[PDB]
């Protein structure tokens, strides 16, 4: 048996990632069972409350809001945890 997903063929027991249509990341397994059955779970990841954009653990990004630029980081930590800091010049 094999799984077919977004035109990609998987062997039974394969694991893979897939982006959901709404933008977030999934981790998936190919089960097969006679009908190429597969399932995907959302992974732990962050969602920017303003832009709706998803970021993966370890990703950083900049927000430009209230006329202020910030740098943000996705920690995850099982709760899609992220934080930002104002853009800052250093020596």
């Amino acid at each position: 048996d094999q799984c077919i997903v977004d035109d990609i063929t998987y062997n039974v027991q394969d694991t893979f990632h897939k982006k959901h249509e709404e933008g977030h990341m999934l981790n998936c397994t190919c089960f097969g069972q006679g009908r190429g059955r597969w399932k995907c779970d959302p992974v732990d990841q962050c969602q920017d409350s303003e832009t709706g954009t998803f970021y993966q653990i370890g990703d950083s990004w900049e927000k430009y809001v209230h006329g202020v630029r910030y740098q943000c980081y996705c920690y995850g930590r099982g709760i899609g945890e992220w934080h930002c800091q104002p853009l800052q010049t250093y020596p």
């Binding site: 799984c3 077919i4 999934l26 597969w38």
Partner: peptide, 15 residues
């Protein structure tokens, strides 16, 4: 608190 959706499929999924 509301989780993100997962996804599933297979040959002959109804949907």
């Amino acid at each position: 608190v509301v989780g993100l959706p997962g996804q599933r499929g297979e040959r002959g999924f109804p949907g």
